[PDB]
């Protein structure tokens, strides 16, 4: 604890995400709707919005 | 757990001694580091070893 | 304003061992980039101490 702030310890958590290629298990709280067909509307497809 | 000097080298397309020998992230690396001090609980006045 | 200037010359600089010596963060370079600085090599180096 006598050291400086350069040698003191430091706790490091990384977080690496694969962006799109699977089917998506990790998503979060954004609630869903029903699927509209033949209109012109926004589209939201698990982030891929439109 | 590293040092204070080394959170420098936990980066994309970064070299040093734990990016080369404990700790390599990719060029193309997607994602989100934290780093925060822990002199009070990862630390001994005998030094931990 | 008595800075102190010291010519570095005829001499094999290596500079993994500044992380040992004093406690920083940052080895903050403007025209180089402080990992690859074991690889060029130049003429004269000059610290100044404040």
Not at chain 3, 19 to 28: C, E, M, V
């Given at each position: 604890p006598t050291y400086?702030?350069?040698?003191q310890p430091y706790r490091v958590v990384v977080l690496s995400f694969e962006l799109l290629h699977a089917p998506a298990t990790v998503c979060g709280p954004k609630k869903s709707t029903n699927l509209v067909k033949n209109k012109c509307v926004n589209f939201n497809?698990?982030?891929?919005?439109? | 757990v590293i040092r204070?000097?080394?959170?420098?080298?936990?980066?994309?397309?970064?070299?040093?001694?734990?990016?080369?020998?404990?700790?390599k992230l990719p060029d193309?690396?997607?994602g989100c580091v934290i780093a925060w001090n822990s002199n009070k609980l990862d630390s001994?006045?005998?030094?931990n070893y | 304003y008595a800075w102190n200037r010291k010519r570095i010359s005829?001499?094999?600089?290596?500079?993994?061992?500044?992380?040992?010596?004093?406690?920083?963060?940052?080895?903050?370079?403007?025209?180089?980039?402080?990992?690859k600085?074991?690889?060029?090599?130049?003429?004269?180096?000059?610290?100044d101490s404040f």
């Open positions: 400086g702030v350069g040698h497809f698990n982030g891929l919005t439109g | 204070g000097n080394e959170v420098s080298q936990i980066a994309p397309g970064q070299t040093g001694n734990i990016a080369d020998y404990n700790y193309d690396f997607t001994k006045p005998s030094g | 005829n001499c094999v600089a290596d500079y993994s061992v500044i992380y040992n010596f004093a406690p920083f963060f940052a080895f903050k370079c403007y025209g180089v980039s402080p990992t600085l074991n690889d060029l090599c130049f003429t004269n180096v000059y610290a």
